[PDB]
Design a protein around this nucleic acid. Structure first.
Ligand SMILES: [K+]
Ligand SMILES: [K+]
Ligand SMILES: [K+]
Ligand SMILES: [K+]
Ligand SMILES: [K+]
Ligand SMILES: [K+]
Ligand SMILES: [K+]
Ligand SMILES: [K+]
Ligand SMILES: [K+]
Ligand SMILES: [K+]
Ligand SMILES: [K+]
Ligand SMILES: [K+]
Ligand SMILES: [K+]
Ligand SMILES: [K+]
Ligand SMILES: [K+]
Ligand SMILES: [K+]
Ligand SMILES: [K+]
Ligand SMILES: [K+]
Ligand SMILES: [K+]
Ligand SMILES: [K+]
Ligand SMILES: [K+]
Ligand SMILES: [K+]
Ligand SMILES: [K+]
Ligand SMILES: [K+]
Ligand SMILES: [K+]
Ligand SMILES: [K+]
Ligand SMILES: [K+]
Ligand SMILES: [K+]
Ligand SMILES: [K+]
Ligand SMILES: [K+]
Ligand SMILES: [Mg+2]
Ligand SMILES: [Mg+2]
Ligand SMILES: [Mg+2]
Ligand SMILES: [Mg+2]
Ligand SMILES: [Mg+2]
Ligand SMILES: [Mg+2]
Ligand SMILES: [Mg+2]
Ligand SMILES: [Mg+2]
Ligand SMILES: [Mg+2]
Ligand SMILES: [Mg+2]
Ligand SMILES: [Mg+2]
Ligand SMILES: [Mg+2]
Ligand SMILES: [Mg+2]
Ligand SMILES: [Mg+2]
Ligand SMILES: [Mg+2]
Ligand SMILES: [Mg+2]
Ligand SMILES: [Mg+2]
Ligand SMILES: [Mg+2]
Ligand SMILES: [Mg+2]
Ligand SMILES: [Mg+2]
Ligand SMILES: [Mg+2]
Ligand SMILES: [Mg+2]
Ligand SMILES: [Mg+2]
Ligand SMILES: [Mg+2]
Ligand SMILES: [Mg+2]
Ligand SMILES: [Mg+2]
Ligand SMILES: [Mg+2]
Ligand SMILES: [Mg+2]
Ligand SMILES: [Mg+2]
Ligand SMILES: [Mg+2]
Ligand SMILES: [Mg+2]
Ligand SMILES: [Mg+2]
Ligand SMILES: [Mg+2]
Ligand SMILES: [Mg+2]
Ligand SMILES: [Mg+2]
Ligand SMILES: [Mg+2]
Ligand SMILES: [Mg+2]
Ligand SMILES: [Mg+2]
Ligand SMILES: [Mg+2]
Ligand SMILES: [Mg+2]
Ligand SMILES: [Mg+2]
Ligand SMILES: [Zn+2]
Lengths: 53, 206, 122, 114, 125
RNA sequence: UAGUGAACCAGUACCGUGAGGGAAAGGUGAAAAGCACCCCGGAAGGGGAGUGAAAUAGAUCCUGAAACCGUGUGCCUACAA
RNA sequence: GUAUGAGUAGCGAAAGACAGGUGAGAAUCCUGUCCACCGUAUGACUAAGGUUUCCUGGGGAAGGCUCGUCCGCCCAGGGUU
RNA sequence: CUCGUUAAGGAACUCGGCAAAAUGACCCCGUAACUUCGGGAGAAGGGGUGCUGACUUCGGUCAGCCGCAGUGAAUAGGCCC
RNA sequence: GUAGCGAAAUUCCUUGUCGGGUAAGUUCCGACCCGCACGAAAGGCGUAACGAUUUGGGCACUGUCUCAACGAGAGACUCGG
RNA sequence: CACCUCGAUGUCGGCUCGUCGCAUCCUGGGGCUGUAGUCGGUCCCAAGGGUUGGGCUGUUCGCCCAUUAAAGCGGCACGCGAGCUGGGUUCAGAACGUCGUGAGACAGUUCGGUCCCUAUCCGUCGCGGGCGUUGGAAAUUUGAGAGGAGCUGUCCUUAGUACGAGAGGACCGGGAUGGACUUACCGCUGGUGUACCAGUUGUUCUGCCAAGGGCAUUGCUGGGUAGCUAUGUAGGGAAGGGAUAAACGCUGAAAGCAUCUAAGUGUGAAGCCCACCUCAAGAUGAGAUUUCCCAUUUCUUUAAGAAAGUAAGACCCCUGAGAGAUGAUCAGGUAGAUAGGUUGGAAGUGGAAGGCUAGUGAUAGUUGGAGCGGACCAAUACUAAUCGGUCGAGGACUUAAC
């Protein structure tokens, strides 16, 4: 099977509506104040839950 | 008559005369009537019933306010029973398993276990194609239809999500009722996974 | 679970030794027959001097099967072989003697004569 | 599970002797041919035990009139008046399914006298 | 249940033994999320055997723990080599005699560059 | 894309066992004066600072169309064939 | 020349794990340990053919179906008695 | 797609037993029609196989032991009219 | 047109008729002979042995099927390249 | 006939999946009968459901065997090859009969012979996101509409009664139990069960013995938990209304009679609408009920203004399964049993290792229903669900009544 008709710019853009990246779970790190991912170790200060690790 | 409970599991019971019958154990902690609906206010007659007390942290201010009328803890399940005598029920009233008696005929409603994405063979019990003799057609859903419509008729059954449907089994028998343990033993097997909600009602056909 | 083309031993001296199933009577689409059911069968191997002889289309009742029966009390019975008895239209066995044990399910099916002749009813 | 066990604990029987697969047992199984009731003895070797609690069952095999026969009984069925251990056999496994193929001498089980 | 980790049964078993022994030796390692969430149970069961300490538990563990050098010292002017199994029963068992399970913890870290595989640090407490 | 196949290291590269077939590819600026130095970056590449009449002439370098891709938004659009 | 299909098919038979090191950057490079694979071969020699692909030191544009600090690649020397 | 298992039945599948299953090593017994007298023939159909003692003429035999199963895995004809 | 063979790799009528085999056989085998349109080196008839040859029957065997169920792996699915 | 298609619309049969027509094969209702009864014949209404398993042949067809209540007839590109098969018919080989002087050919046969395509759009089956539904939220709901289901045997009784000379043998009515189909579920019977238990061969490794690991289809072999499952179990098509079809009426004239019809009134089918099951307010006609939050701040403007903190609430994130391709759903996040571990069990396996005893030994007994024990059960914060962040109202107007 092959495309009977080429896809127009508008239809192509509509389909890609949901083809987007997302960034979730960022919040300030308690120890150093930098942004970190919740439930992850802070890459900057290497502290999690207020302790160095 | 009706009650809400949880599908505890299945076992078997020896009746008098020693016959062995499979039973489903359904627990029903006393349900509570949370609201009474009437023709005047809602246009139809029914009683709202709550079941399975819920931890407070899991409840909402609106939900707590809703159950305050009945003066009970938040309930995990809420369902409306129709075809009952409103005069016999009032907000805050309790419903216990003893509402039924052994040998009662009931309809049991549950939510069937989910199977997820399933093919046509399992989902609709269609026939496979031959597995040999050069066949390259084993578990496929058959022809989609004739040429003329230039389309596929609705209800051409195909693969999809199976289970998770509301199913009622009719004319089950209340084998035993244990008020102390809030248990009803119903002959047979009923839809749903263990710990799921189950609705018992007096059989409509009867 | 006896179906078409399934072969059974013969549990009597009617003359046939091994029969082959032609039909499972009792329904339009019925697929399988179990103990106490009647079948149409053909004799595939017969005793040289017997009454019933090879190639004859006969009726028979299944008296024991590998997949046996479930009793109301929750017990089960299973045998080591599938055997049938050739019978007349009135359920009377064609032979004079029955060999091997027989399942009690025949009584309620009203094969009383076979039950009496059976060396043992289980 | 605990709830189910409590409910079925009542009907659990108590006079069941301690037997295991490989022992010869005699089962006094009640039978009814109409109004009249009778005890028919099914004696044979225990081939299989499975299940738990009220659901437990056991299978007994005997060769009667040259044909092998297996009867499966609920362990706690009231229709079995008595279970009697005739002998204790020496076996090396829980399920004796191999015995089905064997005949006569090959099926013999050494007694142990527990 | 248990995770397949995209390996056949024997391959998954061999990899789990490797990682669990590596954790026994090093006491702290970096792996993927899934490997860590399986290794936690396996290594904690190994520690249970070590706590028991009898010969039966020793042999049961030997079935699983790899035959590797946990550490090497020089004692009395002689080199002393301690295997993974010996370290388990001599050090890790006595250390956790008091804890009732939960001998390991998992800390989530950044995803791996090559695959964006979520990475974790699994370490004894 | 013309003019020799070939304005340029062309009967070359490339293709084929071989005979043989056979391309693509021109233009900074008047003059390299071809961006010293500084800044981000491992570099690439940029932003300043400079050269220049002009750097959106920076070497993919004159002009720089259209397809195609993207940023911004004045109006419209989630009961419609 | 650039689209559409589409961020889709595919990424070409098989086991890798972890620690340490290197480095701007490491699943992929180095070292170590265990594990695994071939073993009338997936080992060791040779003829043809290839024609520098060999070694040493650098590099990470392009090539490598990912990555790359690495390579039968690029750069500079050297090697066949 | 590749592979393992499968109750009861056992070719009812199908154009067709296609595919799969089954047979498979060694030792022993035994082996038909027909025949160009060579064959047919590994026809067919059966039996034995592990371990430990004792004795062996060294191939056995006798005794004992274990398992569901002893060419205990891999590699080995399905046969007949 | 002899011998031999003959509804045949040849027979249209044709699933010829009869018999065997099957519960049931347009196929198969035996026989018959009105050979549409066999026939003697473009050989006739037969033939042990042979055949990944074509054809029919039987035993064994089985997921071929009644009628599908479960499990392992690769892809598919989600994420990064 | 030659109007579309020869810059390609794939041809028989089978399989998979059906759907439609009714000129109805069965079941339902009914009239006439050369209908005594049991059977029937013919015609009328009726398409709700059902309407088979084989032998032969490539077959369709047909014959045969054996069943069934019945084994309906047709249309849908003689439905269905980007869904399958490829046995037949149309390629190249070869052969027979036959025709031809011949190459070759069929007015015929016979053996063998490559079935490609990653789904863009609509369509179909499932699942999300957005926004709407006019303040913002959490639940429970009505049902416009829609889908599903719809079959049927045999036996007992009524009753050996009605009918019949006998043979034979009922309607109506009441019970029992099946077939096929189907909705669920794993307690039982079984299947599977590659991180469960055990036996066992070969080789290799842990230095050796002992005890184990690797590989050999999970090495093989015997069992087997959860889960998923049928052939296993339970249940369903029960009763009953409303309007009708054919048909039968009652009353009744036109037309003194007659007449089911004109007015008027009734019976009457597995059929139609309900009844039973499921989906269902995107039903933009966006419904209803209960509960919760509260009228904040700043600037523009009489603006249904703008933005910014919030409330009730929701989500991100994290631990998960009864859920699952991913989203989603649901159980939880220390206001904690969500998962892992740990402790104690259970299923399951079948008597661990290390010893001791007996035996020359293989091995057996014993310590001991032992040891092991994925998913199952119950406890237990030991580990991890930390800390946090984001979004989220202030409710327009007109006119009735108050
Ligand atoms: K310029
Ligand atoms: K624009
Ligand atoms: K392209
Ligand atoms: K594209
Ligand atoms: K390098
Ligand atoms: K079949
Ligand atoms: K032969
Ligand atoms: K043996
Ligand atoms: K061989
Ligand atoms: K002839
Ligand atoms: K001829
Ligand atoms: K015949
Ligand atoms: K031949
Ligand atoms: K050949
Ligand atoms: K299979
Ligand atoms: K054409
Ligand atoms: K009639
Ligand atoms: K109909
Ligand atoms: K056929
Ligand atoms: K055929
Ligand atoms: K049709
Ligand atoms: K095709
Ligand atoms: K098409
Ligand atoms: K389209
Ligand atoms: K070994
Ligand atoms: K090895
Ligand atoms: K099993
Ligand atoms: K709404
Ligand atoms: K022991
Ligand atoms: K045990
Ligand atoms: Mg089928
Ligand atoms: Mg149309
Ligand atoms: Mg047990
Ligand atoms: Mg393996
Ligand atoms: Mg290691
Ligand atoms: Mg040119
Ligand atoms: Mg310009
Ligand atoms: Mg330019
Ligand atoms: Mg509209
Ligand atoms: Mg609009
Ligand atoms: Mg696509
Ligand atoms: Mg590769
Ligand atoms: Mg070799
Ligand atoms: Mg080199
Ligand atoms: Mg180098
Ligand atoms: Mg690259
Ligand atoms: Mg099977
Ligand atoms: Mg079997
Ligand atoms: Mg057939
Ligand atoms: Mg067929
Ligand atoms: Mg074959
Ligand atoms: Mg072997
Ligand atoms: Mg013939
Ligand atoms: Mg004939
Ligand atoms: Mg000739
Ligand atoms: Mg001649
Ligand atoms: Mg010749
Ligand atoms: Mg991707
Ligand atoms: Mg014309
Ligand atoms: Mg065209
Ligand atoms: Mg009609
Ligand atoms: Mg046949
Ligand atoms: Mg067609
Ligand atoms: Mg098509
Ligand atoms: Mg001629
Ligand atoms: Mg012709
Ligand atoms: Mg061939
Ligand atoms: Mg089960
Ligand atoms: Mg269970
Ligand atoms: Mg040893
Ligand atoms: Mg719990
Ligand atoms: Zn920090």
């Amino acid at each position: 099977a092959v495309p009977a008709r080429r896809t127009s710019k508008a239809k192509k853009a509509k389909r890609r509506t949901h083809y987007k990246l997302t960034i979730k779970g960022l919040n300030a790190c308690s120890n150093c104040g930098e942004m970190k991912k919740s439930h992850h170790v802070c890459p900057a200060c290497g502290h999690y839950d207020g302790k160095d690790v | 008559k009706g009650i809400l409970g949880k599908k505890v599991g299945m076992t078997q019971i020896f009746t008098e005369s020693g016959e062995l019958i499979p039973v489903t154990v359904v627990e029903a902690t006393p349900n509570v009537v949370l609201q009474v609906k009437t023709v005047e206010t809602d246009g139809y007659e029914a009683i709202q019933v709550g079941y399975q007390d819920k931890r407070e942290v899991l409840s909402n201010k609106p939900a707590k306010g809703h159950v305050a009328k009945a003066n009970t803890a938040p309930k995990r399940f809420i369902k409306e029973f129709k075809n009952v005598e409103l005069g016999e029920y009032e907000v805050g009233k309790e419903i216990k398993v003893d509402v039924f008696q052994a040998g009662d005929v009931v309809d049991v409603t549950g939510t069937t276990k989910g199977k997820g994405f399933q093919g046509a063979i399992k989902r609709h019990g269609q026939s496979r194609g031959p597995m040999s003799h050069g066949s390259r057609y084993h578990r496929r859903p058959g022809s989609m239809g004739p040429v003329a419509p230039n389309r596929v008729f609705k209800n051409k059954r195909l693969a999809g999500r199976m289970g998770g449907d509301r199913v009622t089994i009719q004319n089950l028998e209340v084998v035993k009722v244990d008020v102390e343990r809030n248990v009803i033993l119903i002959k047979g097997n009923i839809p749903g996974a263990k710990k799921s909600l189950i609705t018992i009602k007096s059989a409509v056909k009867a | 679970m006896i179906q078409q083309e399934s072969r059974l031993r013969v549990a009597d001296n009617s003359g046939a030794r091994e029969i082959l199933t032609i039909k499972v009577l009792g329904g339009s689409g019925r697929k399988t027959a179990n103990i106490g059911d009647v079948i149409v069968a053909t004799v595939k191997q017969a005793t040289p001097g017997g009454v019933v002889k090879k190639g004859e289309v006969v009726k028979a009742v299944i008296v024991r099967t590998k997949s046996g029966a479930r009793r109301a009390d929750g017990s089960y019975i299973k045998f080591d072989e599938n055997a049938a008895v050739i019978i007349r239209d009135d359920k009377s066995p064609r032979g004079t003697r029955i060999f091997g044990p027989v399942a009690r399910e025949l009584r309620e099916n009203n094969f009383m004569k076979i039950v009496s002749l059976a060396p043992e009813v289980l | 599970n605990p709830l189910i066990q409590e409910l079925t604990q009542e009907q659990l029987r108590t006079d069941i002797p301690a037997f295991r697969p490989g022992d010869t047992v005699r089962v006094h199984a009640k039978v009814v041919e109409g109004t009249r009731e009778r005890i028919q003895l099914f004696e044979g070797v225990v081939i299989k035990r499975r299940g738990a609690g009220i659901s437990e069952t056991y299978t007994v095999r005997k060769v009667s009139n040259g044909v092998g026969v297996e009867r499966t009984f609920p362990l706690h069925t009231p229709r079995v008046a008595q279970i009697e251990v005739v002998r204790y056999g020496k076996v090396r496994r829980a399920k004796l399914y191999y015995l089905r193929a064997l005949h006569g001498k090959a099926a013999r089980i050494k007694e142990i006298r527990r | 249940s248990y995770r397949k980790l995209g390996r056949t049964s024997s391959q998954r078993k061999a990899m789990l033994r490797d990682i669990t022994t590596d954790l026994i030796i090093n006491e702290r390692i970096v792996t993927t999320e899934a490997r860590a969430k399986e290794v936690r149970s396996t290594v904690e069961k190994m520690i249970t055997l070590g706590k028991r300490g009898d010969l039966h538990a020793r042999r049961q563990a030997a079935t699983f723990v790899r035959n590797e050098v946990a550490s090497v010292r020089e004692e009395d002017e002689s080199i002393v080599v301690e295997s993974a199994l010996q370290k388990l029963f001599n050090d890790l068992g006595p250390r956790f005699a008091e804890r009732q399970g939960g001998y390991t913890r998992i800390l989530k870290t950044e995803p791996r560059r090559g695959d964006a595989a979520p990475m974790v640090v699994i370490e004894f407490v």
